Design a protein around this nucleic acid. Structure first.
Lengths: 74, 74
DNA sequence: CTCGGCTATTAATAGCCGAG
DNA sequence: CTCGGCTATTAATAGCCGAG
């Protein structure tokens, strides 16, 4: 918001990591907000380079493993 | 934007489906925008009650299957 | 009884200054 | 040479009117 952003990686390594940290926690926030508004089935996984695994799923990812595996099947 | 929204399911079945369609395509839009700004590892899966499967992954979900399976391992 | 097409406004995002 | 804490503004979201 403080400025109009362009969809491009920030050459500033210091700022580049700053925009991702904002969206990282800022995105998972949406998986929760979008889930409460429609309680839809979603699967969000992130692997920040700072070593941080986060898994959020309003429909129990237990299915995503078998279910997604079914779409991957011919 | 046309109004301040509250994090709650819309009792209006007609509008309830409307907010989800906006976020559904509107969210996957972010997996692409957040991916271009930091090219991070993300896994987005959605199952709309209207029967529509969408899979987006900037880090090839091929790993999410084995990688996520490693965190699920004791 | 219902729906789509086109549009306005708030939150969340990206940022900047001071100190060591 | 580097970082964090606290804050302002634009896009994307949620919506509303007319017609059958």
């Amino acid at each position: 918001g403080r400025k109009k952003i362009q969809i491009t990686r920030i050459m500033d390594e210091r700022n580049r990591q700053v925009t991702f940290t904002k969206r990282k926690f800022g995105l998972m926030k949406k998986a929760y907000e979008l889930s409460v508004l429609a309680d839809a089935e979603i699967a969000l996984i992130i692997f920040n380079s700072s070593n941080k695994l986060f898994q959020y799923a309003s429909t129990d990812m237990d299915k995503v493993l078998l279910k997604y595996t079914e779409y991957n099947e011919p």
